[PDB]
């Protein structure tokens, strides 16, 4: 059970949220930060490397801030 937090450059918000939400293993996606510019993803068997590459290729810059057990 993973928690991954990604900072994304930002209608890029909705595109990023949709892309992350469509990813295999994902149970939840949430915008966090006062400026809602980080995406928290919780789930199982999520590949963060592929997720970051897909975001970078389809939406814009994206940076891993946290990867942990939830």
């Amino acid at each position: 059970k993973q928690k991954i937090v990604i900072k994304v450059a930002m209608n890029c918000r909705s595109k990023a949220m949709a892309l992350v939400a469509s990813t295999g293993g994902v149970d939840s996606v949430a915008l966090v930060g006062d400026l809602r510019d980080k995406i928290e993803v919780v789930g199982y068997g999520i590949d963060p490397i592929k997720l970051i590459s897909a975001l970078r290729k389809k939406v814009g810059d994206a940076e891993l801030l946290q990867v942990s057990q939830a």
Binding site: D27, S28, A30, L31, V32, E40, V42
Partner: protein, 82 residues
């Protein structure tokens, strides 16, 4: 037959930008668990209970009330640490 002390916790997700709801709720049809979730204490929610929408109120100890259709009920309990 209904004993909340034997019911497994719901699947939930607490949105990090709003306060954490203090209650679990459990919905039964003829004493068979249909589903469960979270809700606020001292509050209210509108929920589809079988065929009908029901306005369900919660008190400060997660006791829920509402006009449930025949055979249905929704019951509340305080979450751990609340």
């Amino acid at each position: 037959a209904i004993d909340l002390s034997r019911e497994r916790d719901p699947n939930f997700f607490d949105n990090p930008g709003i306060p954490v709801p203090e209650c679990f709720w459990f919905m039964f049809k003829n004493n068979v668990r249909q589903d469960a979730g979270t809700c606020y204490s001292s509050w209210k929610m509108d929920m589809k209970v079988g065929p009908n929408w029901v306005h369900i109120k919660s008190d400060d100890n997660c006791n829920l009330s509402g006009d449930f259709p025949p055979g249905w009920i929704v019951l509340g309990k305080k979450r751990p640490g609340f």
